[PDB]
Structure 1
Amino acid sequence: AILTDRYINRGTAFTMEERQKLHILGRLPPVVETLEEQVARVYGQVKKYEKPINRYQHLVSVHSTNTTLYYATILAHLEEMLPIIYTPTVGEACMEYSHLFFRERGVYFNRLYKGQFRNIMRDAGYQKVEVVVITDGSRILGLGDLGSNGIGISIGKCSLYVAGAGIDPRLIVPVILDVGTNNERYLQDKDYLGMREKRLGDEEFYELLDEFMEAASAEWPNAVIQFEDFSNNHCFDIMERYQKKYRCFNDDIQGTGAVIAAGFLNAIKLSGVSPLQQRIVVFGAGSAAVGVANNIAALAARMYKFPVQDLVKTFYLVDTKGLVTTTRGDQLAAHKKLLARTDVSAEDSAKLRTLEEIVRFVKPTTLLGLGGVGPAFTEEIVKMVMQNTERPIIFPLSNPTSKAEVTPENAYKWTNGAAIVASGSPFPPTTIGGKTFKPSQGNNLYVFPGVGLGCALAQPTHIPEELLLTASESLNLLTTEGDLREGRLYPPLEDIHNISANVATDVILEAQRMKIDNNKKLPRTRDELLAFVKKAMWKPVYSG
């Protein structure tokens, strides 16, 4: 009952006296270790494997045997483990090694179980669920439809709430809504265990997802519902359909913009060039890219009370046709109209098509890379931004490292260390003339865990944009005057518990201000509330 229960198993951390008392003497090799020693040992076992997928496979066996030791190991080595336990290793494990998720506790829905969703949730036998991560395996980036195998994405995401914000590992639920797959290999694969049919149309999709939201609201009323890795045809419409009626958010949309805005406003503080003096090229004009721009504007308005109209005029949106302007002659998509230049002539628009000529005309102080079309921030373009500011802000956020607009190394080299860089991936430091530079990674881990922990404690009726904006500001303000002097845009990733507790505290205070909080037990003053939030967090230490 002790060794075989992964939540209370301590393995070699059981003392000789504990082993005798628990009648497990001789069930373990004789060495007694501390958790710190067990972590160092597990870290050596992980590094004995060269390939990410094999490191993940090892970590899965640790999680299945000693859950405290698993989470202890992730927190000791967070920056290094992140690429293994989530993007991009987790999607590779879903696509080709889906058996790595068979043993994990999750919930599988499909059309065959229509009208039974509530019964299936009841039967799962959870207590006071706090977080539910749901995907359909469609993929936000629309690469590698995973179908049913998308369960691995929900499982990996749930583990980041536990590690990042101390969501108790028993109070989190990974969910796959299998509405089919358009993955041709899977549709023909004898070993695919999911619904063997093309993805359902919107009407049936929403019937099943409505039943899921309603069942969850009734059976898991304390839960936050987080949408993960839904395709663009659904992810925005899902939030529009449910944001007011259920306690839900989408990390890809709302988390990404909260994190990027926080980093960007710290880049502005370091740059010299204040927010109304910034001239920002937004390379890429999808709904997501425009969402990030709007989140930057909203955050600058909150922190500084500049008129938002004036902040929107700092943005120069570039789509596949060129600079988005009112004089260009095309009918603009709704999301592009708000950021469209009104101050550029038809004749100038005609000559603003390539990024090099747009940069030469706009004279930007910032390049935001949200383009997903490879390395567009060329040496020539970086050299022109150096004419417009002493401290170019360059954010190559497109993933992976090959789709990225520019390497941090190149940005630092070409600017001789002047570039302020945030990345969507970890990069090693660059040294120029004995001076060391390292990009700030805008990882989504900075925001979703603290939103999850704040929404779990506060029990708000719903998650309005105010709570994401509060989380974005909280994150910005956690970057210390010391961190800022060393060129960091974010508090350090390894301090994620403190980050999450602060973000959670600020989200709770906002829910309290709006009177949407249903938990009347919580402190209503920041210092006392922060102390309370920290004590509520589950910690990967042996407890009893």
Structure 2
Amino acid sequence: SVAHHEDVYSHNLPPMDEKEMALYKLYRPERVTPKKRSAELLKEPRLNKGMGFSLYERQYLGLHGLLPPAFMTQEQQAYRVITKLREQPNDLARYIQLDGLQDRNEKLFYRVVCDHVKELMPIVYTPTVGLACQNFGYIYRKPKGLYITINDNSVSKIYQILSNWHEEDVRAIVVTDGERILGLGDLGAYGIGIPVGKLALYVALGGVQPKWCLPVLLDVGTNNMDLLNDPFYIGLRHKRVRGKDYDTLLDNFMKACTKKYGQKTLIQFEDFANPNAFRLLDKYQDKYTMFNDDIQGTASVIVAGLLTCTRVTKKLVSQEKYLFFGAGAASTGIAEMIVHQMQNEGISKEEACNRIYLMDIDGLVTKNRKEMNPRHVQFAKDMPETTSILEVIRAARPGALIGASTVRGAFNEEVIRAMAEINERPIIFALSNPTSKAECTAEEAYTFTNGAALYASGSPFPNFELNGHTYKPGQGNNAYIFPGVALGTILFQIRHVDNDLFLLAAKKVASCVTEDSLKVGRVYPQLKEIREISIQIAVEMAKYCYKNGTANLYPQPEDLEKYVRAQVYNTEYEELINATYDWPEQDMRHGFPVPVVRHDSM
């Protein structure tokens, strides 16, 4: 136990001022002792350390004998996990092993994932998760998510379902109806793995407390005929509901979630069908603490890559011309975000649009097109119609070429060459996923520009070595933005998340790109830096939000950075046993304080 003149768990601390010490004690995480013991404790992923439990811990908590007689450090445990991970036959098996690890030892799970982020991120989420949902179907595991269906349509029915969730302090919810699992399509009730994986990244990359995360899948049916014909499908066996009923379920959902966990609850939409996703974002953006990563996150991270490029083309975003090959959800969202960013730079919206050109399956979007998307009206160009990328390039001489059109290798030598003729350092972004759909590989962009192109892709490409100069092409991964935006939003209870905040996040990502990477053609920070980037984003959001009074956390913490750093998740094992401490010796004595004569009996 601790001495009467000492505080609990305050040993071997760095020298601190009387003021610093107080601020440290105010912000620091306090020990939380569990109620569970023995097997029940070992079966709780948030408490279980496995063989990482010392002998004394095992005896005190009633775990002794239920675990093998070997004792390990978290590091030795992570070694065992990574070793077995790499011995796995394929990525799907690694996904299964990792999902199991999350259900076994949560601290270890994040330790391992954070330590090998570049190697494991594409397993936890990115592209393997969708493949796992499609191929495995119902995956055996601990209840780590909720299914809310069109047959539980009411605030009360949804409330009762949320009430079945173990944790009461839910602050982050990622929901999907499973209609547009990125790169796979409609997988219905099998899409539960998407919210799960997304939240795993909120924790691993953002620092968001795992107990605050709640993955949700809304089941209104599926239009995937293979599933409706599949005798092993476990979702509602009917086509997707879409009338007022669907809109009612979503309304009742947002209500129930906020009625249950509070209006400040962050609800993020993931993998909805493009049109539906945009509609929902427009309806809830200003009513709840919500955002859609596919729309706003994508737009944001690309703008971050472009902002970084600025430092090389020496031309501001408002001083550049952009050509998008493809004008669907991604391109349109990105373009709009670029417009906002240009306005915040001084230019008018009118002139902002003028520097943006859109091409779609029909060709260049011109003011004289039959029936175009409303969101394209302000980008339509007063120029001659064409289907030639080269003709559009020569006419507008853009400084940046961005492809978000599922067309493989549409950025051929002639196109690349063209760009590397009108520009000293051409910006080429091949965003279509996976790499097999990339408008062009990194190798092609550098070779056909003599290594002068500023390239970024949706899917990761190997390093390139041309004439001595080495190139490390970067990925425009949403993971650079959403974790930090989620963290800042949660910790400070930001009421609503708007473009300005995503722009702020994008500017922050750009500012973290080092010179050592910029000299290697890298316009994105290294993935292992997202945790730090996330914290920096969270603090920046606080500053911005307190100024316009949108942060609800009251009062503003005296030291934003310290508060945030004390709030983020710690992958290190913690003590589960209460700390003991002395009271002044005379006050801990047992027995009458004042003597009396003992009673007599029979």
In the alignment, the residues of structure 1 paired with residue 49 and residue 184 of structure 2 have an alpha-carbon distance, to the nearest angstrom, of 40
TM-score (norm 2): 0.85
- In the other structure, the counterpart of 1:430 is 464
Matched, 1:289 2:331: yes
1:370-404 superposed Cα distances (whole Å, 9 cap, x missing partner): 11222210011101111111111100011111221
Decide whether aligned partners of structure 1 residues 39 and 522 sit closer, same or farther in structure 2, where only a CA change above 3 A counts. Answer: farther
Matched, 1:534 2:570: no
- Indicate conservation of the 8 Å contact 1:95/1:144, yes or no: no
Matched, 1:195 2:226: no
In the alignment, the residues of structure 1 paired with residue 489 and residue 283 of structure 2 have an alpha-carbon distance, to the nearest angstrom, of 19
The runs of 5 or more residues in structure 1 that have no matched partner are none
Deviation, 1:414, is 1.4
- Indicate conservation of the 8 Å contact 2:306/2:317, yes or no: no
Provide the secondary structure at the position in 1 that maps to 2:455: strand
One-letter amino acid matched to 1:190: P
- In the other structure, the counterpart of 1:251 is 293
Provide the secondary structure at the position in 1 that maps to 2:435: coil
1:189-236 superposed Cα distances (whole Å, 9 cap, x missing partner): 222121110000231110111110110111011420000000023101
- In the other structure, the counterpart of 2:52 is 13
- Which of the numbers 171, 175, 178 marks the counterpart of 1:130? 171
In the alignment, the residues of structure 1 paired with residue 418 and residue 277 of structure 2 have an alpha-carbon distance, to the nearest angstrom, of 37
- Which of the numbers 43, 46, 50 marks the counterpart of 2:82? 43
1:311-345 superposed Cα distances (whole Å, 9 cap, x missing partner): 3222121122222222x453432111211223x2x
The runs of 5 or more residues in structure 2 that have no matched partner are 1-36, 576-602
Matched, 1:340 2:380: yes
- Which of the numbers 427, 430, 443 marks the counterpart of 1:409? 443
Decide whether aligned partners of structure 1 residues 499 and 283 sit closer, same or farther in structure 2, where only a CA change above 3 A counts. Answer: same
Deviation, 1:143, is 4.0
In the alignment, the residues of structure 2 paired with residue 103 and residue 5 of structure 1 have an alpha-carbon distance, to the nearest angstrom, of 10
- Which of the numbers 453, 466, 473 marks the counterpart of 1:439? 473
One-letter amino acid matched to 1:253: I
- In the other structure, the counterpart of 1:157 is 198
- Indicate conservation of the 8 Å contact 1:19/1:25, yes or no: yes
- Which of the numbers 146, 153, 157 marks the counterpart of 2:187? 146
Matched, 1:391 2:425: yes
In the alignment, the residues of structure 2 paired with residue 377 and residue 146 of structure 1 have an alpha-carbon distance, to the nearest angstrom, of 31
- In the other structure, the counterpart of 2:105 is 66
Q: How high is the sequence identity, in percent, across the aligned residues?
A: 39
One-letter amino acid matched to 2:436: S
- Indicate conservation of the 8 Å contact 1:461/1:518, yes or no: yes
1:112-164 superposed Cα distances (whole Å, 9 cap, x missing partner): 22221112212324222110011000006584311111111111111111111
Q: Comparing 47-56 with 459-468, which one deviates more in the overlay?
A: 459-468
In the alignment, the residues of structure 2 paired with residue 508 and residue 87 of structure 1 have an alpha-carbon distance, to the nearest angstrom, of 29
Deviation, 1:103, is 2.1
Deviation, 1:482, is 4.4
Matched, 1:278 2:278: no
Deviation, 1:539, is 1.6
Provide the secondary structure at the position in 2 that maps to 1:99: coil
- Which of the numbers 382, 392, 411 marks the counterpart of 1:377? 411
In the alignment, the residues of structure 2 paired with residue 360 and residue 466 of structure 1 have an alpha-carbon distance, to the nearest angstrom, of 33
One-letter amino acid matched to 1:455: T
Q: Comparing 432-441 with 14-23, which one deviates more in the overlay?
A: 14-23
Q: Comparing 446-455 with 31-40, which one deviates more in the overlay?
A: 31-40
Matched, 1:104 2:135: no
Deviation, 1:307, is 3.7
Deviation, 1:26, is 4.5
- Indicate conservation of the 8 Å contact 1:224/1:248, yes or no: yes
In the alignment, the residues of structure 2 paired with residue 496 and residue 86 of structure 1 have an alpha-carbon distance, to the nearest angstrom, of 15
Deviation, 1:16, is 4.1
How many residue pairs get matched?
533
One-letter amino acid matched to 2:395: F
In the alignment, the residues of structure 2 paired with residue 356 and residue 158 of structure 1 have an alpha-carbon distance, to the nearest angstrom, of 42
In the alignment, the residues of structure 1 paired with residue 567 and residue 159 of structure 2 have an alpha-carbon distance, to the nearest angstrom, of 29
One-letter amino acid matched to 1:171: W
- In the other structure, the counterpart of 2:306 is 264
1:466-506 superposed Cα distances (whole Å, 9 cap, x missing partner): 22222222222222444434433222210121111111112
In the alignment, the residues of structure 1 paired with residue 91 and residue 556 of structure 2 have an alpha-carbon distance, to the nearest angstrom, of 42
Decide whether aligned partners of structure 1 residues 448 and 101 sit closer, same or farther in structure 2, where only a CA change above 3 A counts. Answer: farther
Decide whether aligned partners of structure 1 residues 192 and 468 sit closer, same or farther in structure 2, where only a CA change above 3 A counts. Answer: same
Decide whether aligned partners of structure 1 residues 511 and 360 sit closer, same or farther in structure 2, where only a CA change above 3 A counts. Answer: same
Decide whether aligned partners of structure 1 residues 531 and 187 sit closer, same or farther in structure 2, where only a CA change above 3 A counts. Answer: same
Deviation, 1:22, is 4.3
One-letter amino acid matched to 1:88: P
List aligned pairs for 1:213-252, cutoff 5 A.
Answer: 213-221=254-262, 222-252=264-294
In the alignment, the residues of structure 2 paired with residue 215 and residue 412 of structure 1 have an alpha-carbon distance, to the nearest angstrom, of 52
Provide the secondary structure at the position in 2 that maps to 1:395: strand
TM-score (norm 1): 0.93
Matched, 1:317 2:358: yes
- Indicate conservation of the 8 Å contact 2:150/2:246, yes or no: no
Bigger Rg, which one:
2
In the alignment, the residues of structure 2 paired with residue 126 and residue 38 of structure 1 have an alpha-carbon distance, to the nearest angstrom, of 27
- Indicate conservation of the 8 Å contact 1:46/1:55, yes or no: yes
- In the other structure, the counterpart of 2:582 is none
Decide whether aligned partners of structure 1 residues 98 and 507 sit closer, same or farther in structure 2, where only a CA change above 3 A counts. Answer: farther
- In angstroms, what is the RMSD of aligned CA positions? 2.0
In the alignment, the residues of structure 2 paired with residue 311 and residue 37 of structure 1 have an alpha-carbon distance, to the nearest angstrom, of 55
One-letter amino acid matched to 2:391: E
In the alignment, the residues of structure 2 paired with residue 334 and residue 69 of structure 1 have an alpha-carbon distance, to the nearest angstrom, of 49
- Which of the numbers 466, 482, 485 marks the counterpart of 1:448? 482
Provide the secondary structure at the position in 2 that maps to 1:138: coil
Deviation, 1:25, is 4.5
- Indicate conservation of the 8 Å contact 1:135/1:230, yes or no: yes
- Indicate conservation of the 8 Å contact 2:177/2:188, yes or no: yes
Deviation, 1:267, is 1.2
